[PDB]
Design an enzyme around this catalytic site. Structure first.
Site, short mmCIF file in Angstrom:
data_model
loop_
_atom_site.label_atom_id
_atom_site.label_comp_id
_atom_site.label_asym_id
_atom_site.label_seq_id
_atom_site.Cartn_x
_atom_site.Cartn_y
_atom_site.Cartn_z
N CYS A 77 0.81 -1.27 0.00
CA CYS A 77 0.00 0.00 0.00
C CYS A 77 0.82 1.29 0.00
CB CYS A 77 -0.84 -0.02 1.26
SG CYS A 77 -1.10 -1.78 1.57
N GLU A 101 1.83 -10.25 29.17
CA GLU A 101 2.25 -8.90 28.88
C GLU A 101 3.51 -8.35 29.52
OE1 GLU A 101 -1.02 -6.85 28.78
OE2 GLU A 101 -0.24 -4.93 27.87
N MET A 132 -10.77 -10.04 37.44
CA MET A 132 -11.39 -11.31 37.04
C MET A 132 -12.49 -11.08 35.93
SD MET A 132 -9.82 -13.50 37.34
CE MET A 132 -8.17 -14.21 37.89
N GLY A 142 -5.04 4.60 4.99
CA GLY A 142 -5.60 4.59 6.31
C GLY A 142 -6.97 3.98 6.28
N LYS A 183 -10.78 -6.25 28.30
CA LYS A 183 -10.79 -4.84 27.96
C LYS A 183 -10.31 -4.49 26.52
CE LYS A 183 -7.33 -3.78 31.27
NZ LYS A 183 -6.40 -4.88 31.74
C1 LIG Z 1 -5.01 -12.50 35.74
C2 LIG Z 1 -4.91 -12.39 34.28
C3 LIG Z 1 -3.80 -11.89 33.65
C4 LIG Z 1 -3.81 -11.73 32.27
N1 LIG Z 1 -2.75 -11.18 31.62
C5 LIG Z 1 -2.72 -11.08 30.26
C6 LIG Z 1 -1.53 -10.64 29.68
O1 LIG Z 1 -0.54 -10.32 30.35
N2 LIG Z 1 -1.47 -10.57 28.32
C7 LIG Z 1 -2.59 -10.90 27.59
O2 LIG Z 1 -2.40 -10.77 26.41
N3 LIG Z 1 -3.78 -11.36 28.13
C8 LIG Z 1 -3.81 -11.49 29.50
N4 LIG Z 1 -4.88 -12.03 30.17
C9 LIG Z 1 -5.93 -12.84 29.48
C10 LIG Z 1 -5.62 -14.31 29.28
O3 LIG Z 1 -4.39 -14.33 28.64
C11 LIG Z 1 -6.68 -14.99 28.42
O4 LIG Z 1 -6.94 -14.26 27.25
C12 LIG Z 1 -7.93 -15.05 29.27
O5 LIG Z 1 -7.26 -15.02 30.47
C13 LIG Z 1 -8.53 -16.41 29.47
O6 LIG Z 1 -9.84 -16.24 29.94
P1 LIG Z 1 -10.50 -17.33 30.87
O7 LIG Z 1 -9.88 -16.53 32.00
O8 LIG Z 1 -11.95 -17.31 31.12
O9 LIG Z 1 -9.77 -18.64 31.20
C14 LIG Z 1 -4.90 -12.09 31.54
C15 LIG Z 1 -6.01 -12.58 32.19
C16 LIG Z 1 -6.02 -12.72 33.57
C17 LIG Z 1 -7.20 -13.27 34.27
C1 LIG Z 2 -4.03 0.74 1.61
S1 LIG Z 2 -5.51 1.09 2.56
O1 LIG Z 2 -5.45 -0.16 3.49
O2 LIG Z 2 -5.20 2.37 3.36
C2 LIG Z 2 -7.11 1.15 2.00
C3 LIG Z 2 -7.83 2.36 2.34
C4 LIG Z 2 -9.32 2.31 2.51
N1 LIG Z 2 -9.84 2.07 3.83
C5 LIG Z 2 -9.88 1.34 1.52
O3 LIG Z 2 -10.70 0.36 1.92
O4 LIG Z 2 -9.60 1.56 0.23
O1 LIG Z 3 0.85 -6.76 34.05
C1 LIG Z 3 0.42 -5.89 33.13
O2 LIG Z 3 1.14 -4.86 32.62
C2 LIG Z 3 -0.94 -6.16 32.55
C3 LIG Z 3 -1.70 -7.36 33.11
C4 LIG Z 3 -3.11 -7.04 32.57
O3 LIG Z 3 -3.37 -5.93 31.85
C5 LIG Z 3 -4.34 -7.92 32.89
O4 LIG Z 3 -3.99 -9.09 33.36
O5 LIG Z 3 -5.63 -7.59 32.77
S1 F3S Z 4 -6.04 -14.43 42.54
FE1 F3S Z 4 -6.71 -13.90 44.54
S2 F3S Z 4 -7.58 -12.02 44.12
FE2 F3S Z 4 -7.44 -12.93 42.16
S3 F3S Z 4 -9.41 -13.77 42.48
FE3 F3S Z 4 -7.89 -15.32 42.44
S4 F3S Z 4 -8.37 -15.07 44.56
#
Ligand SMILES: Cc1cc2nc3c(=O)[nH]c(=O)nc-3n(C[C@H](O)[C@H](O)[C@H](O)COP(=O)(O)O)c2cc1C
Ligand SMILES: CS(=O)(=O)CC[C@H](N)C(=O)O
Ligand SMILES: O=C(O)CCC(=O)C(=O)O
Ligand code: F3S
Ligand SMILES: Cc1cc2nc3c(=O)[nH]c(=O)nc-3n(C[C@H](O)[C@H](O)[C@H](O)COP(=O)(O)O)c2cc1C
Lengths: 1472, 105, 105
Positions: free
Chosen positions: A1, A886, A479, A232, A937
């Site tokens: 692009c 993370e 949680m 974009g 989130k």
């Molecule tokens: C305590 C905790 C820490 C987590 N930290 C990260 C993280 O550091 N990076 C990330 O990409 N997702 C993070 N997640 C999300 C998990 O990697 C995963 O996507 C999700 O936990 C699984 O959901 P389930 O909790 O219902 O088993 C975190 C989730 C929890 C509960």
């Molecule tokens: C290279 S590009 O990804 O910016 C494409 C731009 C635009 N959202 C489209 O659908 O044409």
């Molecule tokens: O430890 C961190 O910087 C992020 C952990 C986090 O964002 C999450 O577990 O929801």
């Molecule tokens: S870790 Fe402790 S506070 Fe997180 S809820 Fe699991 S009890």
């Protein structure tokens, strides 16, 4: 692009302008999906001037005489398969040009060579033909295009009425003509030879290749469009689109004469986002506005209220903002109305855009820079655009205008300020009445009972409302969200529950509403909806708030000032009503507002106030939408403001929905009430109820700003009414009927259900006394009403199970779990099959199965060190995989221990704040997970409370101890899909063995992105459910962002299949999977891998008490506190037991189904049937769209080979080859090579190799040095460890030293360039993103977000775009020059000095976390000096050298920028 | 001649004479469908061939007829799906005995 | 055109002995050549084996092509094996008919 543009500053046509235009287009392919097919691409285009020699001759050769004027051409795509239609098409085309009585010399089949096209494309290839028109009427340049314009629309329209498909007029003017089509840009010239003719000459050019979320090629969707070309995406599009439905209701200008109606709708069906933009941009220009004015009215720059901005400009801006609501989204634009040629930026400088100016009097606009040869020798300047800027050329006068000078000019056009001064800011008038006293008139006996009507609770009052009032911030929590999904709920939930906030994933980045709040905004205007077409001061006559938000005080303030002008509609309905009560109610309101508005009314006030024992309230959300829509549907919304009073409103989400489904203004009246009551029991203490509200209000204001930033939107006016939600649970018909466009992939309840539930809760509250609300167990399990997945019994039993190691106990747990009422979609499915059952022994083994399981990424930080490594040990013990998370991973951990246990984690993440991201980290794994998002989130990015930022933690992360880590919501090097694409390349470059994954979060539209991810070489894609867990996160996201995995996971399965990419990538999912069946069902929906977090936490002991953010873990799971970490009893053995059970329970199920393996059942949705009905009233869901198969019945089989989607070599390929001695003997080496904008990630492979043999630091600086002439393309030196040094004599593009890791990179202009080192750009954006070690030296300026997140690199550079040093946490950052807005925002820890010759830095820097002083202590003064010396030594920089020559006077000019939190930490204090 | 069949790129329309500009569009006649480099075909040969019917067995079952002149009775089933039964027989008969050389039946 | 990296590799630094040249000059050359992936030539007179490793700085003093000439100077199983190329020196243009000299001092 790419987008690009070229222009002869003098105005005079030339062939080189086109030849350069090609030249460019030949250097962008490194940024796209190459097909193995060799031919197929998404679209390319070049917009040049109709070449009158070339054409005229043509007319001559047939033997006409060339006219004196300019001769027009239509460039047209006709249906190519139905001759019958081509005709209809040509009659229409002719008729229309004919009634304007112009003249037809006639058609010309364009030469083209379809050999270079792929079949997919030749399939949809239209029949390309030119039609030549003459200005027999002798009108003027300006009149010809005007007329032609009305003609093209006329055609466009008639073809439509005829119902003709595939017709399309790229261009049709006598100034410009467009040659775009679906073929590789490098081959534009091949598919269209006209371009290679010397008669093609031109004063300007605009090229553009494009990418997509597709395999399907439509031709009209390739750009450039008619006036525009866009790189974009415009996230604010549905917003814009619906606004025009009203803007139009009034647009009228005299140039179109009687034509206007043919002129509408300005936006036809089937347009791409940019296409729609060009559409609007065009009308506006056709009616008189210059190009530059229009860029502004539509993609205005941010009005930061600051000194940075002259006052002329501010006027103007304010003008625009009042006429038209922006078109937001990352956007490099290349534009031109007939005369001017403009390069422009979006308000956040979201996309690259370099440029060069030559001695030959040309400007070449670009996306990257090495894009077209130019001898340094003839370069007079080397710029770029920053947020909001433009650069332009007025071809009539052959004058170039840079941003300032151009904006100067436009300020000049009218009495902007005098005009602006015409607005009534009813702010102060409103604040006044608040201080005069936020009233309250209900007695607790009431508050309580209404409150009960909308089913409110204590949890609601204590948990969520309170913190708002107190801290002026919204509740944070922890949680996942394990409650039912609202439709399935058992308990009155309010509409807002079913609307999910949308957010953005790879298409565009979300913004930082903390660090970047200055660009955002919540201004609100009542009555500013008139003639986008007009340009008269009467356009400033409107009232203006600064938040759609009003406290009961301020509300009435306003409602009075309005008066005779306002109208109040009764959003309420009888209960004695009948089955149709709410329906007719909804009609009524709809009509009454009509009459009112017609009647002359100019403001509407919709309200539940008359709610009582005899009247239920209409769900404000539904009432607002019903009204706004019908208003649009009758062209009336342009005549009022629409303001709502709601008794049910309470949190940020509710405002967001209301606003973006219409609402101008909102007043949560029964909540200010509830606030008071709290306040008279002194729950807020000393604090006046007024300051009370104030806070509330800020919490809801930042509330919104946030929810918005989740889909990079910076401004409420575009957000409003845009319907940015997705409905889960309400019926299709309904959502269509009454709210703006939103998806509701399964219909759900409708009015009749809604009615019934509304009324039930109603009886609850007027059927008898009410002294206390119920407790509530929505945000937490109480043994009360709301159920949750994880509830005590269930947790105990599981714990019992993995602790005592009994599968029988496990089985009793899962039964406990499966025997409840449906709570989640999968719960509504039965699994029936047609095979007789098989013996369990026969199925695949646990060893086998458990390997498809993984333990998600949960950071070191969020969890105790003990918990974290526990997990790594469990997973490696059973040959599976765990995910670092993370936040870093300690490298000690890179070996198995005396006991054989292995603490190292197999999959490492890469997320926004690049935590421990290091050449060695990236290399200690089998898989890299790009974390674009978590279901807890989506729109946002991690948090780690400061008191968890232990020192070990801080050491890991290169952060500052005990200071909080909030992450940037978007990755800084992933602002659009090509961007993703390139990250994946670097990733596969630094680590040749790993697969790359992309964590994405389910939501409708994921499917499509999913595809692009696939074309971008990702190996695995993971879709996360709305309900997953987080150690810390605001509660609205935990309860309102995201969608269930059952929807997103199939959508990806489907779409990927539908584009034949589904075999290119493996699929993974997580979100609440606690059970054997949860895992089978996910397979049938398409998954191959399953992630299990929380339940793995619970086995390690979590008791689900939810204080993960607090650092008070009863059990040592998520807490950094020492004493508390000693209460941890997790064990590998426990987790291993968890997985063992899960798999065995999976095998138990497959056997019943007749399958002997998981693979035999992936995608097999025919094995699932939706049963469940689970309510009293006939309100059902449609689970079909999830169960459908794309190509049902037997599948063909594409052989997939075991490994990873491989990638093309780079310079590193040779560098390595040339370095034998390095690796073989240890020698030191100096190599030289040229470098083009087309070579990416140079060195990174080298680095991987070096890190592997000597480690990040076993080589002494400069051991292997490679000089490079020319231009480095993206990711130059990314992840370079020490020992490597790259000199780039020439220049570079974005991401120099991305993740720098102790290596060294230097970049200076060519000895022969005559450029003033410091007055010219030299390296792109997001330089040093997340670095941790090494130096970088740059004879020149750097672009936006320089040194973002730097965590320990030392750099010297002669200038820098805006948003510099942002979120920096370590390192030294010198800076010989001017510095962009918001400098140092969130800069918690490192230090930057900053030579400032105008004592301006004060006006640009972002105070909040940093301070500046002049150097005083002399070790800080010495530190600087030595760097600058280094800088010079490396870069031979004059300007630098000279500062050295006058150190004395000069040191005087810098400014030490030092982080507050670093003051007392710093060995040598900064002060005397 | 071959090198030029279909090559309309070699013909431009000049249509001139003495009148008022009232012109024709000879384009639709001149346009190419998939313009630009052609694939090369080798000489396709013979005739679009067609499926046998019952006659391909009658003839086989009839060697004696054509070889020795015998007289024969053949029995077969027939379906609405089999067409032109007898016609190839006829061709063979005509060619070797002429339309009238064999006595009826 | 082809690249410098590429071309310079066809270049070599001839054999000039340790003896005829200062130790400093000699190894300088070995370092330059190995740095650019080319080759240098030990020369008629030995090469010190310490030199058989790259140094802390990454520089490599060992020479890639070793000679073999009349008086077999440092010619050793290990010398002959510390290279990619053996140059049989039958003669130099400075003194074809003859053979090296190294003054006693
Ligand atoms: C305590 C905790 C820490 C987590 N930290 C990260 C993280 O550091 N990076 C990330 O990409 N997702 C993070 N997640 C999300 C998990 O990697 C995963 O996507 C999700 O936990 C699984 O959901 P389930 O909790 O219902 O088993 C975190 C989730 C929890 C509960
Ligand atoms: C290279 S590009 O990804 O910016 C494409 C731009 C635009 N959202 C489209 O659908 O044409
Ligand atoms: O430890 C961190 O910087 C992020 C952990 C986090 O964002 C999450 O577990 O929801
Ligand atoms: S870790 Fe402790 S506070 Fe997180 S809820 Fe699991 S009890
Ligand atoms: C100082 C010096 C030392 C030399 N020593 C040797 C040697 O040891 N062995 C050899 O075979 N040739 C030797 N030669 C010759 C070179 O290897 C090569 O053949 C010739 O130097 C290159 O000639 P040019 O000097 O014009 O560059 C020597 C030449 C010089 C000048």
């Amino acid at each position: 692009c790419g987008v690009g543009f070229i222009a002869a500053i003098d105005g005079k046509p030339r062939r080189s302008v086109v030849e350069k235009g090609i030249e460019a287009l030949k250097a962008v392919w490194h940024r796209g999906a190459v097909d193995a097919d060799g031919k197929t691409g998404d679209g390319a285009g070049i917009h040049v001037a109709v070449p009158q020699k070339f054409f005229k001759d043509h007319v001559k050769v047939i033997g006409h005489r060339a006219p004196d004027n300019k001769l027009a051409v239509g460039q047209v795509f006709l249906p190519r398969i139905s001759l019958d239609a081509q005709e209809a098409c040509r009659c229409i085309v002719e008729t229309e040009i004919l009634a304007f009585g112009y003249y037809i010399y006639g058609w010309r089949q364009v030469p083209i060579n379809v050999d270079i096209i792929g079949e997919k494309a030749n399939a949809t290839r239209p029949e390309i033909e030119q039609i030549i028109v003459g200005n027999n009427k002798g009108v003027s340049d300006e009149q010809f295009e005007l007329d032609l314009y009305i003609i093209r629309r006329r055609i466009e329209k008639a073809v439509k009425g005829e119902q003709i498909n595939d017709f399309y007029i790229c261009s049709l003017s006598a100034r410009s003509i467009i040659y775009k089509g679906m073929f590789l840009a490098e081959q534009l010239t091949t598919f269209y030879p006209d371009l290679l003719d010397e008669r093609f000459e031109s004063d300007f050019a605009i090229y553009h290749q494009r990418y997509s979320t597709n395999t399907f090629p439509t031709w009209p969707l390739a750009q450039p469009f008619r006036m525009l070309a866009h790189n974009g995406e415009i996230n604010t599009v549905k917003g814009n689109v619906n606004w025009m439905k009203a803007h139009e209701t009034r647009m009228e200008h005299p140039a179109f004469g009687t034509h206007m109606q043919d002129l509408k709708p300005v936006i036809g069906v089937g347009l791409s986002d940019s296409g729609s933009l060009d559409t609007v941009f065009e009308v506006m220009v056709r009616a008189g506005r210059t190009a530059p004015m229009v860029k502004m009215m539509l993609v205005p720059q941010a009005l930061t209220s600051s000194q940075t901005t002259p006052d002329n400009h501010k006027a103007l801006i304010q003008y625009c903002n009042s006429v038209m609501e922006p078109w937001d989204g990352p956007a490099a634009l290349a534009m031109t109305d007939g005369r001017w040629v403009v390069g422009g930026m979006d308000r956040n400088g979201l996309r690259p855009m370099r440029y060069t100016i030559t001695t030959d009097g040309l400007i070449i606009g670009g996306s990257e820079t090495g894009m077209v040869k130019i001898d340094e020798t003839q370069v007079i300047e080397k710029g770029r655009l920053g947020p909001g800027e433009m650069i332009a050329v007025d071809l009539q006068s052959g004058k170039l205008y840079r941003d300032r000078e151009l904006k100067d000019h436009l300020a000049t056009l009218k009495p902007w300020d005098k005009w602006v001064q015409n607005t009534t800011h009813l702010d102060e008038l409103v604040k006044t009445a608040s201080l005069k006293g936020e009233p309250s008139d209900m007695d607790k006996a009431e508050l309580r009972r209404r409150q009960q009507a909308f089913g409110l609770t204590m949890e609601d009052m204590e948990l969520i409302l309170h913190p708002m009032v107190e801290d002026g911030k919204e509740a944070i929590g922890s949680m996942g969200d394990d409650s039912p999904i609202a439709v399935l709920s058992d308990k009155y939930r309010g509409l807002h529950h079913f609307f999910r906030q949308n957010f953005s994933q790879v298409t565009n980045p979300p913004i930082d509403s903390l660090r970047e709040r200055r660009v955002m905004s919540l201004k609100t205007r009542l009555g500013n909806l008139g003639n986008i077409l007009d340009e008269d001061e009467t356009q400033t006559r409107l009232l203006q708030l600064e938040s759609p938000v009003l406290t009961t005080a301020e509300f009435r303030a306003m409602r009075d000032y309005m008066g005779d002008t306002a109208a109040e509609i009764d959003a309420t309905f009888p209960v004695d009503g009948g089955p149709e009560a709410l329906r007719d109610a909804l009609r009524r309101i709809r009509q009454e507002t009509e009459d009112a508005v017609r009647g002359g009314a100019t403001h509407v006030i919709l309200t539940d106030e008359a709610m009582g024992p005899a009247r239920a309230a209409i769900p404000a959300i539904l009432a607002t939408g019903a009204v706004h829509t019908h208003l649009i549907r009758s062209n009336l919304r342009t005549f009022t403001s629409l303001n709502v009073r709601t008794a049910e409103g309470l949190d940020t989400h509710y405002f967001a929905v209301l606003i973006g489904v219409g609402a101008t203004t909102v007043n949560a009246y029964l909540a200010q009430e509830a606030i008071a009551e709290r306040h008279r029991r002194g729950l807020f203490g000393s604090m006046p109820l007024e300051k009370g509200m104030a806070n509330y209000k800020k919490a809801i204001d930042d509330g919104l700003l946030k929810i918005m930033s989740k889909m990079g939107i910076s401004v409420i006016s575009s957000y409003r009414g845009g319907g940015n939600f997705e409905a889960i649970g309400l019926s299709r018909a309904l959502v269509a009927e009454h709210f703006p466009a939103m998806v509701s992939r399964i219909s759900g309840i409708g009015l009749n259900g809604i009615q019934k539930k509304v009324l039930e809760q109603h009886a609850t509250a007027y059927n008898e006394e009410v002294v206390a609300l119920p407790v509530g167990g929505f945000y937490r399990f109480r043994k009360s009403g709301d159920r949750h997945g994880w509830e005590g019994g269930v947790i105990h039993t599981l714990q019992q199970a993995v602790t005592n190691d009994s599968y029988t106990t496990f089985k009793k747990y899962s039964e406990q779990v499966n025997k409840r009422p449906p709570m989640q979609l999968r719960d509504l499915l039965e699994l029936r099959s047609t095979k007789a059952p098989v013996p369990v022994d026969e199925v695949e083994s646990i060893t086998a199965i458990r390997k498809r399981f993984i333990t998600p990424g949960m950071s070191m930080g969020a969890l105790s060190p003990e918990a974290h490594g526990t997990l790594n040990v469990a997973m490696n013990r059973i040959g599976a995989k765990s995910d670092s998370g993370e936040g870093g991973e300690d490298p000690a951990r890179f070996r198995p221990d005396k006991n054989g246990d292995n603490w190292n984690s197999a999959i490492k993440q890469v997320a926004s704040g690049r935590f421990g991201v290091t050449a060695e980290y990236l290399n200690q794994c089998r898989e890299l997970e790009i974390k674009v998002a978590q279901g807890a989130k989506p729109g946002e990015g991690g948090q780690l409370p400061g008191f968890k930022v232990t020192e070990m933690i801080a050491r890991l992360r290169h952060s500052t101890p005990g200071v909080m880590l909030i992450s940037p919501p978007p990755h800084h090097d992933i602002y659009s899909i090509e961007d993703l694409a390139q990250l994946i390349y670097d990733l596969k470059q630094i680590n040749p063995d790993a697969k790359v994954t992309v964590k994405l979060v389910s939501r409708s539209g994921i499917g499509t992105i999913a595809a692009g991810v696939a074309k971008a070489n990702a190996d695995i894609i993971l879709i996360s459910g709305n309900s997953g867990g987080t150690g810390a996160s605001p509660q609205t996201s935990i309860k309102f962002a995201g969608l269930p995995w059952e929807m997103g996971l199939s959508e990806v399965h489907q779409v990927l299949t539908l584009n034949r990419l589904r075999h290119r990538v493996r699929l993974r999912t997580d979100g609440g999977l606690k059970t054997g069946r949860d895992i089978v069902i996910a397979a049938m929906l398409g998954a191959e891998e399953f992630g299990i977090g929380t339940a793995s936490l619970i086995a390690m002991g979590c008791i689900m008490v939810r204080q993960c953010h607090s650092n008070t873990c009863p059990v040592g799971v998520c807490v950094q506190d020492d004493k508390l970490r000693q209460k941890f009893v997790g064990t590998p053995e426990k987790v291993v037991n968890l997985f063992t059970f899960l798999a065995e329970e999976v095998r138990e199920i497959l056997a019943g189904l007749g399958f002997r393996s998981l693979n035999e059942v992936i995608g097999r949705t025919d094995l699932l049937h939706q049963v469940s009905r689970g309510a009293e009233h006939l309100d059902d869901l449609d689970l079909n769209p999830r169960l459908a198969q794309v190509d049902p019945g037997e599948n063909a089989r594409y052989c997939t080979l075991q490994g990873r989607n491989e990638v093309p070599d780079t310079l590193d390929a040779r560098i390595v080859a040339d370095a034998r001695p390095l690796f073989e003997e240890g020698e030191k080496m100096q190599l030289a090579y040229n470098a083009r904008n087309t070579q990416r990630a140079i060195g990174t492979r080298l680095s991987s190799m070096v890190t592997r043999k000597f480690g990040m630091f076993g080589l002494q600086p400069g051991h292997i040095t490679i000089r490079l002439r020319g231009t480095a393309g993206q990711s130059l030196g990314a992840f370079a460890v020490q020992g490597i040094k790259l000199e780039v004599m020439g220049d570079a593009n974005d991401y120099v030293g991305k993740g720098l890791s102790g290596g060294t990179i230097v970049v200076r202009p060519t000895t022969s360039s005559p450029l003033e080192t410091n007055k010219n750009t030299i390296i792109g954006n997001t330089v040093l993103y997340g670095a941790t070690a090494g130096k970088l030296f740059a004879a020149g300026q750097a672009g936006e977000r320089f040194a973002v997140r730097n965590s320990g690199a030392t750099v010297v550079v002669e200038g820098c775009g805006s948003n510099g040093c942002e979120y920096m946490t370590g390192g030294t950052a010198v800076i010989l020059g001017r510095v962009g807005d918001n400098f140092a925002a969130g800069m918690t820890g490192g230090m930057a000095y900053v030579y400032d010759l105008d004592d301006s830095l004060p006006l640009y820097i972002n105070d909040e976390s940093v301070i500046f002083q002049r150097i005083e202590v002399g070790h800080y003064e010495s530190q600087l000096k030595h760097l600058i010396e280094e800088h010079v030594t490396e870069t031979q920089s004059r300007f630098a050298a000279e500062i050295l020559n006058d150190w004395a006077r000069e040191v005087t000019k810098f400014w030490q920028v030092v982080p507050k939190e670093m003051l007392n930490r710093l060995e040598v204090p900064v002060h005397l």
